[PDB]
Design a protein around this ligand. Sequence first.
Ligand code: SF4
Ligand SMILES: [Zn+2]
Lengths: 75, 85, 319, 77, 303
Amino acid sequence: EDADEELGWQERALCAQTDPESFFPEKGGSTREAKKVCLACEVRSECLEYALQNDERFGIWGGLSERERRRLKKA
Amino acid sequence: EAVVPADAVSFTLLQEQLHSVLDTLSEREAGVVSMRFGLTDGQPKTLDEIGKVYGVTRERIRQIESKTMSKLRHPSRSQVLRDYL
Amino acid sequence: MLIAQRPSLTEEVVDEFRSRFVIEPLEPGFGYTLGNSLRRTLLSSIPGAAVTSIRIDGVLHEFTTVPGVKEDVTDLILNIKQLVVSSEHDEPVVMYLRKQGPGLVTAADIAPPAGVEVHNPDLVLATLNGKGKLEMELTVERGRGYVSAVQNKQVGQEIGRIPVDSIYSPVLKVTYKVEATRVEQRTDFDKLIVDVETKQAMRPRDAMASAGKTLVELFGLARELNIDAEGIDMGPSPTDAALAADLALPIEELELTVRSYNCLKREGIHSVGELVARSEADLLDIRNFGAKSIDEVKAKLAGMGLALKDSPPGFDPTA
Amino acid sequence: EGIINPPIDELLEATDSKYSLVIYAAKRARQINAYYSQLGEGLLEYVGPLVDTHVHEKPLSIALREINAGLLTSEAI
Amino acid sequence: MTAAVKDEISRLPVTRTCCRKAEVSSILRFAGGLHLVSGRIVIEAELDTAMAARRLKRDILEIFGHSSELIVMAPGGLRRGSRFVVRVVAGGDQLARQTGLVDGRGRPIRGLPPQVVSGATCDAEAAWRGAFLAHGSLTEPGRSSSLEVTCPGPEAALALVGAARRLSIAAKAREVRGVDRVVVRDGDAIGALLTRLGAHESVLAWEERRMRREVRATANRLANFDDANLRRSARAAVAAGARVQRALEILGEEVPEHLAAAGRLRMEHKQASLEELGALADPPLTKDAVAGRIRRLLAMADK
DNA sequence: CCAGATCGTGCGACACACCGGGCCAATTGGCTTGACAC
DNA sequence: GTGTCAAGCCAATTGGCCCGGTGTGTCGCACGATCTGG
Ligand code: SF4
Ligand SMILES: [Zn+2]
């Protein structure tokens, strides 16, 4: 369009159009919904890179949970 | 060293937006964040006092703060607050 | 080059015979290139018919008054001048008015010969008092624009002839103006407003069409110098531009009998254009033919009005 | 059309002078603006507009139109 | 059935600007589309409701500043729907950009706009009002009911679920054969939600209906609620018999032997199952024959 | 003509559709306990 | 007394992932009726 400017990859996150509470389950909640949503987001690689760089162990980023991020970070 | 009206109105809008965003969270999470950063009274509090009021461990209180802090810094609730930073 | 914004013409009706046309949005300038041209062509380039001279009676040039009639010579001439007539004879044609007695002599009392007509019989031409008589003759002929009695004075002298000004042009008054109209794009795009007022005979729209045709001919006269010369291309002609939505569509049909669609699909027809034209012979000769199938490819084929054996646009398939 | 609508002569037939008309129209405009601002929240005494409006019309113009049409009355307190 | 509830919802007066913007965005996101033409964009919205088309038209014009068309060509294309298609041509690109459908200088947006999400709870109520107006169905799989709205994608379904959560309600996304929807199975939750949207008369009618009907003890469990469901499919066959009496009002158009016999067996044995009815034929015909015969009887009596 | 498209008819296949009933898994959320830095 | 990290365990979720009745409807197709048309 005529915006001619991009703030970054945040503006192009699919999860913005979806329940923000579904990415932080609670009391035995599931993860299939958010993980399925992430697999269509275009900036998934950028989201995962940002999550790894900031090394936060809460919520799910890039389509992976906290445990998956820990396992990936082990190497 | 005067009050620029644009900056004052911007700060007031930021305060309103922060209160609105913190409302979407649960009561416990919003309360712990408010009493940790002292939004209501401007008096920062230690983790142990927060646990005392909540009757939980200090480390457990530290756990809650991190969860909410990451929740706000997510690519689903950040864009409502990105501009003000 | 491409104009990139095709101007449009819109009419408004003020009275029975008064209109106001708006052309917009014209490129910067171009509100004066074709404003004075339209006004002058309207006012001086449309054929008409009018009275040229009159013969009130055997006695005249007593300008003080014509005996028997209340008014004077000048008022009578003006009333005659207001008359609107239509004629077909190239040569002048003479008609007579023979009202008698007291009363109000009007246009309906005239006795035009064949080939001429008077469009406002209700016009009042004079008033007769004291059992007066008014035996008048009117000569009518065709012309263009406004030509005065000067250029109509006759060297040959006749006792009763009196030449009068002739108003041939159907349009009586034309005015125009231009304004700025663009906000979205850059300003300085011209909007042209022309107010036209004619007489009872002709409507403003016909006058506008005739003037446009005459100007188109006049400027084609110069465009003929080198036909392969680039100009400003309007581009999307409205007629075919609109009809492209249904005439040259690749899809042969959307809703119709499946039997006929299947039969005609694998027989040498893909886009409705290939079928609209040369339909009868193609449907007859080849194995694919139907008696009542015509009803499905003749009447229901006209999505928005169409008959077969019609010339199809876009004969080149955009493969 | 624009800032010359409605005409001042027609408006002055509904009041005593320009000075009173100014305050009359200003008070009505403030009422309309307050009604718009608090329309979503709990109901309040404010009412109007009483005439057809546009997408984003100045409340003062609506107040002047209402005054001209004769849908308002001014008392003395 | 639903039409009355949708009418009550639409006739309701809405005041807060944010709610109106959210409702317009939701309706445009569910039952509307973009039709690229001449390198520009035009917006169409097909609604299967009486006046919600006027509501969307007025809201667009007032809060966004645009002029609509409201062509009443039926949406189904067969002219039977008699439902309204509102179009925006001039400036529709700006409406698309500032309603949330398309933003970020890129493709359209799959789910609900980011602005409707993350807003006051009233904003979520408006989002549900719009979504339930676009599509919807108030089904009764038995005596207790279940709402339904066929969202145009999993992202929209999940967004609606999340918006429901903020209203204290319980919602469940679901998908079948590639088309997905949102279902709230619990009847009490159904009433709770339908109260928020604005409808009350419809809420009262639904509450009285379900309350009176549901209180039919059948020991639950299998073969005790399952027999209750055979009887409920028999009540569905009673509705089919009502369709057969509609066919009788039409006279059935001098039907042949097979369909007449099938209808007679269904009516006389109003509780007998399709298999049981088929077992009653002189030449024993299977459940398939009765199924096809009722299918074709309904097709014939459609008029 | 009479033969395929469309549909009547009919038989079956099969995907649910319950409607509940239950064993186990993910993961994981919450809480604590200890340990290490002030 | 505070502010981090680093494990560790139990528990109610959802959820996977099934058993077990019929039952129903969408398709998936054979025969055949009827119709419209090569
Ligand atoms: S990958 Fe990141 S940005 Fe994309 S939907 Fe998932 S959490 Fe949002
Ligand atoms: Zn709201």
